Write a new protein. Structure first.
Lengths: 146, 148, 158, 143, 151, 144, 149, 146
C-alpha cells in the first residue's frame, strides 16, 4: 500500500451503492456591485455557474457569509461593509458591520446561519443585503451544494 | 443533543481576504457502463468520466486510482459470468488480465485493479483506461479517480 | 607491535592549525555533473485579462548557475505581484497548473488586503506528477491585474 | 496526496539566484618523472562540473590517486605539497601502493584558519609521481 | 558585580592596589557602524572600507577592521509602481564572490532589507583602500549597518 | 561553523548610535614634586593616544596610582591620593608605601555611585603626592 | 606472561601494507630569540628569525604564528622601571593595539604577550614581520608559539 | 572565552624554561639498495638528512624497524624480506622474516627494540642487516632524535 510499483488485483465483490450526482461543500468566491447608500440583494443564482463547477446544481444550503470590500473607499474615509441576512421564512434586521482601521485596507465581516435556519434556496432566492462605501464587495460564501 | 450552537445568526470576525480557488479538485468514483462483444476487447475511453451526468463536464484531466468492473447483464446459456481487465497506460500498456468469475450463473462476475502511485498521472478524453472482456454484453464500472 | 606512522598537528576535534594527512583508500564513485535542488527567482510580464504560460526554459540560465542542465523536476510554484495594481484596486494573482500528460483547470488565487501590498499564492505538485520538463514545456498559466509577477519555483535540476 | 494543492504563501522571501554550492570535483593532471606539477585552481571552473559560473572557491581537502600504471618493476607513489598564497608548505604527503597493479593514494586536509578563496591563477598543491597521470578529487566550496 | 544587592557605600573607599597591571591605551572595539551610500540605477556600488574609519563613529584612530556581517536597507523611496529591493555581492581580497543576496519589500511604502554573514575563515583585516561589497538597488540610497571588530 | 558566506534575513531598520559610550581603563603618567600636590586634570583622559578624542565628558569610577620612578636615596616609595569633586573636595589621604625600596608604592580609591557624575577637561580628578618624581595612574571610567 | 610488557629482547612486528608517510612534517614550537630595540623607536620583528638552524627550523619556509610573549632582556635606564610594548602586525592590515607590561621591581623583567585569533592565523614568510616592539630596555626576549609548515 | 575574533592580551609572567633545539619523535621513510642473497647493513647516518628535517641532530634512539620490499621479485618468486638487529653491545642472530602471498604484493616484517637496548646511535653505526630477493627495500624506522 502506497509502496507498490505495479498494478495489483482488487478482489471486488457485490456491486456497491452508487450515485453519479453527489453533493458538494464549497467556499464560493465572487463579487457584487454596490451603490452608495443603497442595499444590494445577493442572488443565490450567482452560486450556480460553470465558473465554480456548479452549473449542475439547482439548490444550495448556505452556511455562512463573509464579505470583503473589493475596491478603495471614498476620499478621507475608511472602508466599511454591512450584511443583513435574508430568509424566506422571515428576513432579519441585523446589520453586521466591519470597518477598516487603515484607509488602504479592506473592511470585512461575516455571519453564520444556525442549523435550524439551514434549508435549501434556489437561484431566485436572495442570501443577504450588502451595504458599503466601496463600489464592489468580494464575498466568500460557504455552502453545501445539493 | 447539547452539542449544538445557537438558534440565531451570529457575527463572524472575519480577517484578511483568504486564498481562494473557484475551480477546485474532486476525488470521485464514477459509475457507468460499457458495451462489450464476444471475443472482442473494448477499450474504455477516459472521456466517459467527463460528463454533466457526473457534474464533471468542467474538468478536462483526471488521475485514475483504481478500476472495478461488474457484469451488467446475464451470461450465455449454460455459462457463468466472467470479466477481465487489462490496464492501459500512455507510457506503456500492460499485459495483465485481471479476471473474476461468478460461482452462481445468476450472479455478477467482478474484478478490479489498483494503479500504483508512480503511474498516477493525468489522462484526457482521447486516452483509454483499460481493455475489458466478458461473455456478457455489458459491463458496469466504478472508477475511483481525482478530477483536476 | 604496531607503533608510529607520522605526526600531523591534530589537536582535539575542532580544530587544527596546520594541514593534516588523509589516509585515502580506493578511488570513490564520482559524478562531475550532479543534481541540484534550487529555489529559482524570476519575473514574467503579464497583460490584464490574458493568461501567460510560464516556459520551463526560464529555469535554465547562467543567471542561476543552472546552464548545464536540460531537465528539471518542479516541486512547487509561488508567485507574487511585482508591480502595483490599477488605480482603486487590490492586487491579485492566479496560477493554473500545466502538465504534459494533462493540464488542470484550477485557478489558485491570492489577493492583497492592502492596496500597497503584494498579492501572493502558490501550489504544490504531488509526487505522482513530479516528472521532468524541458525548456519547450510550460509550468503554469499566470493571471494578474499587475503588469509583472515575481515567481519563485522550487525544483530539482538534473 | 495525488493532486495539486494550494500554498498559502506570504510575503516575498529573501532570494539568491547565485548560491554557493559545496562540491567534490574530480579531474586528472599530467605528471612528468622527477618534476613537480602545480595544480591550477582554474581547473575547477568548467562547464564540465557545472561550476563555470563561479570565479572563487575555498578548498577544504585534496585527495589524489595515480591514474595510470607505474614503471616496470615499481610500485605506484603519489606526493602532495600544499600551496598557499600567504606561504607555501614544505610537506610531502606521500602514498605508495603495496600491489603493483593497484593505485597509490594520499590526501591532505586544509585547516579552518587557511580556508580562504582562490582564483584560477593560484595553485592548490604540487603533485609528484612515477605514474604519468594522477586523478584528483578536491572538496571545496564554490562562491 | 560585587553584592548587586548591597550597593550602600556613600563615600570613597580605599583600593588596596598591588602590582602595576598589563595595560593597552589603544584596545580593540566591536561596533555596528551605520552609514549610507548613494546608488545608481543598474549599477553596482563598491562600498569602501574607509567609510568605517571616521570621527563620526569614534573610529578615526583605527586603520584596520575585521568585518563580521553586513546588513543593508533601502534608504529612499523606490521608483513609481515598484517595490524596493537591494542586492549585496560580497567582495574579498583573496577572491570576489558572485552571490547576490537579495531582499525585496512587500509593501511599496516599506524598506527592502537583506544581509550576509562572513565565515570565520574569511575574517581577516581590511584597510581603507579595500572594498566590502557591491550594493545594487532601485533606490538612490542604501542604509548599511556593518558589524565589525576595529583593531 | 560554516566555511562560506550565509544570508541574514534582516528586518526593520534597528535603533542605531554611531557615537556610543565606552568603559575604559586609561593608563597615563603625571609629574609630581616633593612636598606639593599635583591636581590631575580630567583633560588628560581625552586624547587620541587613548581613542577618546571624540569625547568631551567622562564618568570616573575608581583611581589607581603607582610610583613610576625610584624614590630618594634611603627612602621607601609612597604615594597619596586625595579625591576632588565639584560639589565638595575631600580630605582623605589614601596612602600606600613600598616595603622594598626597589618596588613601587601603590594605592587607589573607589568613587561611590552617588558621586559618579560627569566631568570635563576643566575638572580635576584628585591630588597626587609622592616622594617619587612621576606617578602612573590607571583610571577606570565611562566615556560618554 | 613474564613481566607483562617489560620485554628484554627484540620482538617481531607483524607489519602490513605500506603506510602513508611524510618525510617533512609540521612542527609546533616555542621559539626563543632576542631582538635589539632603540629608545623611542619601534622594531619590526622579522619572521625570518624563526627560520634558522639554531632552532632546527631552517628546512621550513612558512610558519603560522599563534601567540607572542615578550620579556625585557637587559636592565632599564636609571630610576626607571622596565616596560615592553607589542603592536601586532598583519599582512591584511596592521593593528594599533599596544599591549604593554611594566615591572613593579626595577631589578625584574617587564613582560606582556598577545594571542592571535584563529581567523587571523595564516602563514608568514621570512619577508614578513610579526609585530612592533617598544621598550625602555635595549634588548627584549621573545618566545613565539607557532606552527612550522 | 573561546570564540575570539581579535587579538587578546596574554598576561605573561616570569621568563620560562626554554630550549631552542628539542628532541623529535619521528617515523623516517627511506629506501636502500640490495643484492640477491647478500645481507646489506643499514647505516644510522641515513636518518640524519635535510630531506627529513634532521640534519641538526647527531644522535638518535631507535625504537622499532619495519621493512617493505620496494621492487618486484625475481620471476616465479614471491617477495621476501629479512631483518637482523645489530647492536653496539652485541649483534643479534634473529632473522625476522616476512613473505608475500601474492607475487604482485610487497613482503613486510619488522622488529621492536626493548627499552633496555634503546641507547643512542651515531651516523657511523648500523641499524640492522636486510636480506631480500628484491633489489630495493623500503624502511620505516620509528626513532627519537636528540
Ligand atoms: Br513492485
Ligand atoms: Br495478480
Ligand atoms: Br456499498
Ligand atoms: Br463533499
Ligand atoms: Br471550495
Ligand atoms: Br459545471
Ligand atoms: Br459611499
Ligand atoms: Br439562541
Ligand atoms: Br488563507
Ligand atoms: Br483549493
Ligand atoms: Br475532493
Ligand atoms: Br463520488
Ligand atoms: Br456479441
Ligand atoms: Br443456463
Ligand atoms: Br484474454
Ligand atoms: Br461470449
Ligand atoms: Br604527516
Ligand atoms: Br596545531
Ligand atoms: Br565510493
Ligand atoms: Br552524485
Ligand atoms: Br542538492
Ligand atoms: Br537555491
Ligand atoms: Br518567461
Ligand atoms: Br510517486
Ligand atoms: Br487588469
Ligand atoms: Br500552506
Ligand atoms: Br511562502
Ligand atoms: Br514563505
Ligand atoms: Br525569508
Ligand atoms: Br542564498
Ligand atoms: Br551546497
Ligand atoms: Br559534488
Ligand atoms: Br620524486
Ligand atoms: Br556551467
Ligand atoms: Br619530493
Ligand atoms: Br605557486
Ligand atoms: Br618515474
Ligand atoms: Br587590551
Ligand atoms: Br568591545
Ligand atoms: Br556599537
Ligand atoms: Br540613478
Ligand atoms: Br575619533
Ligand atoms: Br579614535
Ligand atoms: Br560550507
Ligand atoms: Br537569519
Ligand atoms: Br533595535
Ligand atoms: Br548605543
Ligand atoms: Br563599554
Ligand atoms: Br597630566
Ligand atoms: Br607629602
Ligand atoms: Br587639560
Ligand atoms: Br581618537
Ligand atoms: Br546613585
Ligand atoms: Br620628597
Ligand atoms: Br624477555
Ligand atoms: Br620471533
Ligand atoms: Br611535529
Ligand atoms: Br631579530
Ligand atoms: Br616611548
Ligand atoms: Br618608530
Ligand atoms: Br636545521
Ligand atoms: Br641578549
Ligand atoms: Br631585590
Ligand atoms: Br639591589
Ligand atoms: Br577560522
Ligand atoms: Br629609553
Ligand atoms: Br572577538
Ligand atoms: Br624541551
Ligand atoms: Br645494488
Ligand atoms: Br642481484
Ligand atoms: Br637470504
Ligand atoms: Br647500538
Ligand atoms: Br630500561
Ligand atoms: Br655492523
Ligand atoms: Br634471492
Ligand atoms: Mg477597500
Ligand atoms: Mg628588563
Ligand atoms: Mg616486492
Amino acid at each position: 500500500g502506497d509502496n507498490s510499483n505495479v498494478v495489483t488485483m482488487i478482489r471486488a465483490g457485490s456491486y456497491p451503492k452508487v450515485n453519479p450526482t453527489p453533493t458538494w461543500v464549497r467556499a464560493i468566491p465572487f463579487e457584487v456591485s454596490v451603490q452608495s447608500g443603497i442595499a444590494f440583494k445577493v442572488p443565490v443564482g450567482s452560486l450556480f455557474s460553470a465558473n465554480f463547477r456548479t452549473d449542475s446544481f439547482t439548490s444550495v444550503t448556505v452556511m455562512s457569509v463573509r464579505a470583503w470590500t473589493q475596491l478603495t473607499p471614498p476620499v478621507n474615509e475608511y472602508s466599511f461593509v454591512r450584511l443583513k441576512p435574508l430568509f424566506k421564512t422571515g428576513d432579519s434586521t441585523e446589520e453586521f458591520e466591519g470597518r477598516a482601521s487603515n484607509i488602504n485596507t479592506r473592511a470585512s465581516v461575516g455571519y453564520r446561519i444556525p442549523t435550524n435556519l439551514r434549508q435549501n434556496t434556489v437561484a431566485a432566492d436572495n442570501v443577504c443585503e450588502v451595504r458599503s462605501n466601496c463600489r464592489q464587495v468580494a464575498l466568500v460564501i460557504s455552502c453545501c451544494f445539493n
